[PDB]
Amino acid sequence: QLDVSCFAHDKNIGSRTEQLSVVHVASAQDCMKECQALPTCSHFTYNKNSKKCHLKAGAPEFYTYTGDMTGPRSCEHNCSDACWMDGNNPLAVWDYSGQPPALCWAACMGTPGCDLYTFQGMTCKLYSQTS
């Protein structure tokens, strides 16, 4: 089935975001499938007890409610460092271990076309904005 392992099932995590719709289904995987059938579903809350799947467009608004679990449209969106929705290849990728952020800022200043940088871990990466 669809992968539902990236979010907790047993921590009563709900989202209050306004619903696109609500449907009874027997599993988190079915809830995700219903999310994926709607072009604007970002996430869903599935309740184990009520068997209600609540599909949502907006950003999550987490809260506690018994038997809730909140998943993403797909667990495959696993980027965490610099994540462009439409994709974006870096101008440059350099090792700046032992360097302050301000030197990665300098690398960007000094690179024609650089609009922004990210500096997670040891990696100074330079980006141009999406065309």
Place this chain on the structure above:
Amino acid sequence: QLDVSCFAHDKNIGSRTEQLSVVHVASAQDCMKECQALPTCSHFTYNKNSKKCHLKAGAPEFYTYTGDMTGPRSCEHNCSDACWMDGNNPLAVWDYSGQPPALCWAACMGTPGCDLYTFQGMTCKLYSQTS
């Protein structure tokens, strides 16, 4: 009265980047001050033995040379997440403890104008491109 604490003074870090100017100065702080008086200086290398201060426009090109230290135009550029040269506050910063990065993806999808996100330390940050 200029902050030179953000880079190392005693690790023999030079930069081979082509210079914009060379002067002799008494301290790393005076070298930074020289860099800040030149609109295109991105960084500098100061040598504690020769007292030579080399101001540089291009991206750093790090290498090892005894007595060298390489600082940024200013230590104030301390953004390390996703950092725009023109400034650009996040659309949102949230504590996403206990959440997968996919739910930050979801947040970006559901947030008008969000073009990219980062997810460091379980902190979801949304950004719009500047325009």
